[PDB]
Amino acid sequence: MLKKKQLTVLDLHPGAGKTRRVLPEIVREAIKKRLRTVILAPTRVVAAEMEEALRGLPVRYMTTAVNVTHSGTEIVDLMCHATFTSRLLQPIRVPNYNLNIMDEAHFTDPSSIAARGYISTRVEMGEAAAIFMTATPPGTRDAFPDSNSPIMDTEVEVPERAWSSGFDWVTDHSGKTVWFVPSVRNGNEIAACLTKAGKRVIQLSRKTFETEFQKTKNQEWDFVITTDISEMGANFKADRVIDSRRCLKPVILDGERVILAGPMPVTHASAAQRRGRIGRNPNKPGDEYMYGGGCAETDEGHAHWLEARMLLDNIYLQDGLIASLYRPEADKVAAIEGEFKLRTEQRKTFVELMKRGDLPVWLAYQVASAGITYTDRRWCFDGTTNNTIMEDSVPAEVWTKYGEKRVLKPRWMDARVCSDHAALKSFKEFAAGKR
């Protein structure tokens, strides 16, 4: 695998031991061969599990998620996918790693897609080797891959709202269930319904993942209600997955706004990863996968692939050259390579709107490409009436940094800034000049 100009897809089935058995062997061989190596974890939680798998190997953990005193003599770095793309974008020296290992390489967040594009381009240039670890590489059509033990697969109607009757099978179960929902708001409703029926429920989403995931270890629970983030190597001691088979798809309309379309079917890759949370113990056959819909290739036209091109257009590669998306996922977007390349000061603004502003890539790009500086929030208030953001069926209101109460009405409307109460709270703070 470790020969320059090679990209290997390590596609062993979910739970085959890619992270705990194969990765340490790759890292040992890399160190023997004096390959400057990066290991890319999708989340802080996976980063911490990798430290356990790699314990004693000389690895620099470029994350506060791990408490280790480094030798200063590691030639293997571990960081999150997002950290890699972030450091590429910033005026910070990122080593030209000889070996690029991406764990949970199916992750479809923009920074993960961008990271794959950059890495696969360096490999295509003959500059580096790469290993993408995933059961479900891009364009996989198999929602039912092999498992460590047999899974009972049942197509069944799955609730997406509170219910009073008609789903006894949900609550009659005595084991532990991981339940994939299409949104935080949908999980909040199902979670309240299960809590009312006497169940102990933990909710996971991107924003809450590290804190809340720890509860799955520290307390007894009946249900984990999770968004798609738990597709990314999150492991549970569960005997059932309930899968809505639905997700939200961000869609750019007319180059002008972003809506969260759906819910609509997940990809085969997503369904396989959701299912893949169970059947992982060869000694516990008969874990259950209950699935409420079909799969479809809903990554086609999904805004994350356009956002990945906005990131890659702003990463230095060599002179004016620009990294391509990883070939198998390159047709998910219709983008002119280099169309999103920004001049130095607009690029810095773009980066800061994402890193400090916590804005979605697309919205950060609209603001930066308009020549607005990071701290200039006038655009959060001067949009069309139809861009009015609503809070409890009334226009959301903030006090501007000038001390004026205004309706939140952004010039560019990205549905991700108000997809749930926490998102809207964060965006209100942004519009008020509080970060």
Q: Which stretch binds ligand GV1 (CB under 6 A): 48-56, 59-67, 268-276, 385-393?
A: 59-67
Give least dist CB 72 to ligand GV1, A.
10
Q: Which is nearer to ligand GV1, 83 or 186 (CB)?
A: 83
Nearest to 239 by CA among 151, 148, 169: 151
Q: Which stretch binds ligand GV1 (CB under 6 A): 61-69, 259-267, 290-298, 332-340?
A: 61-69
Residues binding ligand GV1: number (CB under 6 A): 4
Q: How far is CA 311 from CA 90, 205, 206, 305, in A?
A: 11, 23, 20, 10
23 is in an annotated binding site: no
175 is in an annotated binding site: no
64 forms part of the interface with ligand GV1 (CB under 6 A): yes
324 forms part of the interface with ligand GV1 (CB under 6 A): no
Rounded-to-integer distance, Cα 289 and Cα 274, Å:
9
Give least dist CB 278 to ligand GV1, A.
33
94 forms part of the interface with ligand GV1 (CB under 6 A): no
81 is in an annotated binding site: no
Helix or strand or coil: residue 135?
coil
Q: Which is nearer to ligand GV1, 64 or 164 (CB)?
A: 64
369 forms part of the interface with ligand GV1 (CB under 6 A): no
Give least dist CB 17 to ligand GV1, A.
27
Give least dist CB 62 to ligand GV1, A.
4
63 forms part of the interface with ligand GV1 (CB under 6 A): yes
Rounded-to-integer distance, Cα 84 and Cα 114, Å:
10
- Per DSSP bridges, beta strands 390-391 and 394-395 are antiparallel
Give least dist CB 77 to ligand GV1, A.
8
8 forms part of the interface with ligand GV1 (CB under 6 A): no
Give least dist CB 57 to ligand GV1, A.
15
DSSP, residue by residue, 211-249: HHHHHHHHS--SEEEE-GGGGSS-----SEEEE--EEEE
Nearest to 341 by CA among 317, 360, 376: 317
Nearest to 400 by CA among 431, 375, 379: 431
Q: How far is CA 150 from CA 2, 155, 244, in A?
A: 34, 16, 21
15 is in an annotated binding site: yes
Give least dist CB 208 to ligand GV1, A.
21
197, 171 contact by CB (below 8 A): yes
215 is in an annotated binding site: no
60 forms part of the interface with ligand GV1 (CB under 6 A): yes
Helix or strand or coil: residue 270?
helix
Nearest to 228 by CA among 264, 199, 258: 264
Residues of the binding site: 12-19
Residues of the binding site for ATP: 12-19
Q: What does the binding site for ligand GV1 look like in residue numbers (CB under 6 A)?
A: 60, 62-64
